[PDB]
Amino acid sequence: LKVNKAVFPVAGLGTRFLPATKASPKEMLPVVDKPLIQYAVEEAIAAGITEMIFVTGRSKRAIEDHFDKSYEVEAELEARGKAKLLELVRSIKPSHVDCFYVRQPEALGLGHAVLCAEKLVADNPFAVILADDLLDGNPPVMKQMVDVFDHYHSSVIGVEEIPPSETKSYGIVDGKEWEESIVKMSAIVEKPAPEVAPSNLGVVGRYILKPRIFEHLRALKPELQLTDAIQALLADEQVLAYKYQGTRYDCGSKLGYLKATVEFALRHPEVGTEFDAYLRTR
Ligand SMILES: O=c1ccn([C@@H]2O[C@H](COP(=O)(O)OP(=O)(O)OP(=O)(O)O)[C@@H](O)[C@H]2O)c(=O)[nH]1
């Protein structure tokens, strides 16, 4: 049917960004002036998703207070007639967008984080969006994928072409190329050595999953691997890999985070020009 829900796992330990992540999850890191998780939610909104499910771990309130109403900030902005900033703050969570929270008690990995959201997804297809993967696309990547899902009504795994030497960092898909950008998947293999990688198509943190993924998650022998659930699912039904149009910034790591900051600052209306001039003359 329709993709109304997006699950955002934001419960990782984020040790690669200590000390900043001590009391704020990695997905709250700002790129210029905006947390990763807000970029991710805005992508979901652009895709027609209206229900945001956050799987929280440590520092859940950074996520919750970012999206929930804050009386203090509005009373502060109200008391100063700063109306454009008020519209900006309110657009963090537009009307008709709902935020639900669920706890992952133990940082038992991504597949387990997804499993924590099972009762909230129930018997519906749902997006899984990893805000650490900051995707820059027009149209937004999850919107592209929702269009793919609406056509084929199969799970959709976002993929990008990666250097063959780097396959050990990625889930790698295999299958029959269907369109220029659609692979009908025959396999997904977790972090293969370059010489045995079945393709150069690496999985990124964008998924549309049909609810049968949950029975394969609960069934796995435990850190449950999302890859293994996907591999199991494609034995029972079509799963598609989608070579999205756009650019991924691996903000799980410091370098991708920095690249994202640079690239997004350059396209920022307020500071783009000066930051470009600064970069040239430094
Ligand atoms: O227990 C977990 C682990 C990971 N995740 C989620 O899975 C995705 C991938 O996150 P990772 O598993 O790569 O962990 P991390 O980047 O937070 O950890 P460090 O390497 O910085 O130590 C992110 O969306 C994260 O929030 C969970 O929700 N729960």
Side-chain angles (χ1 to χ4, degrees), residues 3-11 27 37 40-41 44-45 49-56 63 98-104 109-122 124-132 142 205-209 211 213-214 217 226:
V3 183
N4 294 124
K5 300 158 198 288
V7 175
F8 301 90
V10 292
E27 292 84 1
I37 185 56
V41 168
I45 291 165
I49 300 177
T50 53
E51 173 176 342
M52 315 298 158
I53 302 155
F54 300 88
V55 185
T56 69
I63 292 282
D98 293 305
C99 298
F100 307 143
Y101 304 94
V102 58
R103 318 304 186 199
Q104 180 179 40
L110 170 57
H112 185 268
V114 172
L115 185 51
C116 298
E118 162 164 36
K119 308 277 189 63
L120 295 102
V121 160
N124 305 282
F126 65 104
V128 177
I129 304 174
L130 307 193
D132 290 348
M142 184 49 74
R206 297 295 192 276
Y207 317 78
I208 293 177
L209 305 172
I213 197 72
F214 285 120
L217 278 171
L226 191 56

Side-chain angles (χ1 to χ4, degrees), residues 57-81 83 85-86 88-119:
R58 198 201 313 125
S59 312
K60 67 199 185 239
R61 219 149 275 121
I63 292 282
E64 302 181 349
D65 298 359
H66 186 73
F67 293 98
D68 296 353
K69 152 140 180 185
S70 178
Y71 284 77
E72 158 158 20
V73 334
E74 293 178 59
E76 280 158 347
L77 293 174
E78 269 152 2
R80 289 158 172 98
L85 286 165
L86 202 71
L88 191 65
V89 162
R90 299 240 187 87
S91 78
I92 293 179
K93 180 193 154 296
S95 67
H96 312 341
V97 178
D98 293 305
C99 298
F100 307 143
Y101 304 94
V102 58
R103 318 304 186 199
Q104 180 179 40
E106 299 303 320
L108 295 171
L110 170 57
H112 185 268
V114 172
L115 185 51
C116 298
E118 162 164 36
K119 308 277 189 63

Side-chain angles (χ1 to χ4, degrees), residues 36-81 83 85-86 88-175 177-178 181-211 213-220 222-223 225-245:
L36 287 166
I37 185 56
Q38 183 170 341
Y39 287 98
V41 168
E42 285 173 353
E43 180 177 333
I45 291 165
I49 300 177
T50 53
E51 173 176 342
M52 315 298 158
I53 302 155
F54 300 88
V55 185
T56 69
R58 198 201 313 125
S59 312
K60 67 199 185 239
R61 219 149 275 121
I63 292 282
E64 302 181 349
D65 298 359
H66 186 73
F67 293 98
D68 296 353
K69 152 140 180 185
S70 178
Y71 284 77
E72 158 158 20
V73 334
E74 293 178 59
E76 280 158 347
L77 293 174
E78 269 152 2
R80 289 158 172 98
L85 286 165
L86 202 71
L88 191 65
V89 162
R90 299 240 187 87
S91 78
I92 293 179
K93 180 193 154 296
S95 67
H96 312 341
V97 178
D98 293 305
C99 298
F100 307 143
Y101 304 94
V102 58
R103 318 304 186 199
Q104 180 179 40
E106 299 303 320
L108 295 171
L110 170 57
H112 185 268
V114 172
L115 185 51
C116 298
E118 162 164 36
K119 308 277 189 63
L120 295 102
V121 160
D123 195 21
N124 305 282
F126 65 104
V128 177
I129 304 174
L130 307 193
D132 290 348
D133 286 344
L134 167 57
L135 272 55
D136 177 42
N138 176 35
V141 173
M142 184 49 74
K143 167 58 174 158
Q144 301 174 34
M145 295 176 54
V146 157
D147 288 356
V148 166
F149 177 91
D150 289 347
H151 183 212
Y152 296 100
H153 303 113
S154 301
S155 303
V156 186
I157 317 294
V159 297
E160 55 166 7
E161 293 188 68
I162 55 143
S165 57
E166 294 181 28
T167 61
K168 198 108 182 186
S169 302
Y170 296 89
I172 296 304
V173 305
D174 190 21
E177 165 130 76
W178 190 311
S181 57
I182 293 278
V183 167
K184 181 180 184 314
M185 287 169 58
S186 58
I188 173 167
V189 54
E190 182 66 0
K191 295 179 180 177
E195 64 274 14
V196 289
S199 70
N200 72 337
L201 297 178
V203 172
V204 303
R206 297 295 192 276
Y207 317 78
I208 293 177
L209 305 172
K210 294 164 72 182
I213 197 72
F214 285 120
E215 82 206 16
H216 294 300
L217 278 171
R218 276 186 273 93
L220 294 186
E223 302 257 331
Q225 283 305 137
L226 191 56
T227 292
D228 291 325
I230 290 172
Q231 173 66 36
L233 180 58
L234 60 82
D236 295 337
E237 63 184 75
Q238 169 165 280
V239 171
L240 305 178
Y242 175 61
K243 304 148 94 303
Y244 63 87
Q245 186 182 281

